[PDB]
Structure formats: C-alpha cells, structure tokens
Ligand binder design. Sequence first.
Ligand SMILES: CC[C@H](C)[C@@H]1NC(=O)[C@H](Cc2cn(OC)c3ccccc23)NC(=O)[C@H](CCCCCC(O)(O)CC)NC(=O)[C@H]2CCCCN2C1=O
Ligand SMILES: [Ca+2]
Ligand SMILES: [Ca+2]
Ligand SMILES: [Zn+2]
Length: 367
Amino acid sequence: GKKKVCYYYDGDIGNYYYGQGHPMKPHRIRMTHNLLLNYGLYRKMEIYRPHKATAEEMTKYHSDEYIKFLRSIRPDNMSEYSKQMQRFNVGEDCPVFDGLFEFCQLSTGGSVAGAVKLNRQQTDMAVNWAGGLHHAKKSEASGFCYVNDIVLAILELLKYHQRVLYIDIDIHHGDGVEEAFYTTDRVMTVSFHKYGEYFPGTGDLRDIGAGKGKYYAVNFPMRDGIDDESYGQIFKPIISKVMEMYQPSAVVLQCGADSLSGDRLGCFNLTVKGHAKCVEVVKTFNLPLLMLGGGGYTIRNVARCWTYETAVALDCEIPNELPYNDYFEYFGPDFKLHISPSNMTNQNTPEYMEKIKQRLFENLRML
Ligand SMILES: CC[C@H](C)[C@@H]1NC(=O)[C@H](Cc2cn(OC)c3ccccc23)NC(=O)[C@H](CCCCCC(O)(O)CC)NC(=O)[C@H]2CCCCN2C1=O
Ligand SMILES: [Ca+2]
Ligand SMILES: [Ca+2]
Ligand SMILES: [Zn+2]
C-alpha cells in the first residue's frame, strides 16, 4: 500500500558554491525543496534535518589521511597543500570551496540517517536529494564527489541486511560504489549509463565483479539520445530479473537527474515521467528503499524531477501546473512540471537494447 516516507534536508545546503562556471549547483536542492513545499508534499511526509556526519562515520570507508585532508583544506591554505590536492584529486573538477567539509557532512548525514531509519523499520522509504555522490573513492575525490555517502549508507544497511541492491540511473557510471563492493556478493551494483568517450570511462558490460563479487556488478552501457520508451523497456525487465535472482532485503536507488533531456552535461533524452518510471518500478517490490540524488546540471529540470519523484514515493498525484514558488521564474516559459523530449536521434537501436539485455540476462543466470 502507501508508504511512510522520511525526507532529509538542511536549509544551508543551497549556499555551498563550487565556483564560477562549475556545473554542480547545490542551490538545485533548495529549489527542489521549495517546489515540493509549494505543492504541499510536507503534509504527507516527515521532514528531518540531517546531522553533520563525523570523521568517525566517514572512515567506516574512507582513509583517515583523506578525511583529515578534507577537514583541513580551505581556499586560504591551498598554496600550502599543492601536493596533497593532487594526491587526493582535489582541484578543478572537485574544487576547494568555502565550507567544503560541512557540505560533505550534510550530504553524508542525510544518507546515513536515512539508512539508520530504514534499519530500525521506522520508515519504508528515506529520501536524501543532497546525496548520491557515487564517484568518490576510498582516498580520492572524483567527478564533483568528495565523500561517498552511498557506500557509507550501504555499510549501515549491511549491519541488518544480508543483501543490498544498488541501482544507479545517473547518466554517469557509478564507479565509486561499484569499486567499493566489487569483490563482495553482499551488495549487487546495477548501473545504467552513457558509455564511450564519457566520464568516468568505466562501466563496460564486461565489468561483472571479481572473486566472491563475480556476477554481482551489472553495467548497462548506452549511447546518446535514449528516450522514455527505450529506457522503460529495458529497466523493468533487468530490475525484475535482478530482484528474482538476487532477492535483496533493502534497496538504494541513485536518481541522478543528468539523464534528462536538455541536461548541460548529459546527452540522454528522458522526460521526468520516463525517469520517475524507474522509481515506480523499484517501489513495486515493496522493499525498504533509500532514494538519493546525484547529477543534474539544467537545474530547473532537476527541481522538477526530484519534486515529481518525491510525489511518486508518496503515491501523490500533483498537478502539471507549477504552483507559485521562490524560484518561479526559473521554470519559464511554460511554468509546467513535466518536460518534452528533444528531436535528438536515439543512437540506442531497439536491437542494441535487446542484445545488451540478453547479455546481462546470461550473467544473471550465473547467480
Ligand atoms: C574544468 C575542469 C576539468 C579540467 C574539465 N571538466 C569538465 O569539463 C566538467 C566540469 C566543468 C565544466 N565547466 O565549464 C563548461 C567547468 C567550469 C569550471 C569548473 C568545472 C567545470 N566535468 C565533467 O563533465 C567530468 C565530471 C562529471 C562528473 C559528474 C558527476 C555525477 O555523475 O553526475 C554525480 C554527481 N569531468 C571531466 O570532464 C574532467 C576530468 C577528466 C578529463 C576532462 N575533464 C575536463 O575537461
Ligand atoms: Ca548510472
Ligand atoms: Ca558487488
Ligand atoms: Zn552524473
């Protein structure tokens, strides 16, 4: 039936700034929040402010040296940390900005708090749109991600769940989460992403895990222009097969919105309905679910996507006419919640989609 939803948000998150021209805009989390408050969704869910995750919490995965560096580095002392910055991959893609460590603490606090709430059976679904920073590595920042809140949230879930399923619908391969759990069968990682001359360069369908983790890493590489119909015809069958074979007792769904049509960095052609169809599919399995954010660089579309996905999590129909909000002008010229796909060519032929699905089904038979 309808589910209890716990949502994590800190009013300060929107003030963190990556720098002039950087595509990652934490302000998009504030726009999402303001939009869902104006739709009245606060009436249907419990809103929590996450705690700031500590160094102890972060070192359940990350190295002590890397976390000590993140806690120390500031724009005023960068000159003294030149060598350290290069070692930890902090610089241009992952800049040093005012309050960087606090931003990591808030993003992580929401994911970990959500996992705790699910473990305690106090909620059916936990939502943290400030989370989903899937590229961060044990001792290195990557692709705008510094602390891997997902890996930390999964490790929390593993205290009470023998098998955890991770699903990543961000346009980028969730390399950091895959790497952390590559040699274990206690976490199955499933990533759908653009592959071929595209960041981070990983996620080939032949990357299937290693040792005890062999067959517990699933990658669906895609080309430019995938649309709602093509994505929907592959997502439901793959996830259904994964659920049948793997039988997880908890799920983590990374909802990176950069897979939408018109994204600044992405080259997919999904609409908000096409993207949210994934949430709907995962929700039908009735398992404890942690929903996270991630990418999304055309910020009006990110707010639309995550507001609709929160409404989907709540089983609450919301009108297409956007209600007035603090960021109403960002939603012009239509002021509608839903988006139209572009006329871009879908390079993912129906035969290519079926072939990759068939190849992944062969791997799933090995479970
Ligand atoms: C200016 C920073 C980099 C020097 C530059 N990155 C980008 O163009 C851009 C960043 C960038 C673009 N502009 O202006 C057009 C910037 C302006 C200032 C700072 C950074 C950027 N980076 C990339 O696309 C990707 C990262 C994508 C991360 C997605 C994260 C997620 O999956 O969605 C989850 C949260 N990285 C790159 O392309 C980097 C590293 C590999 C080699 C090529 N790269 C780049 O040319
Ligand atoms: Ca992905
Ligand atoms: Ca694995
Ligand atoms: Zn992304």
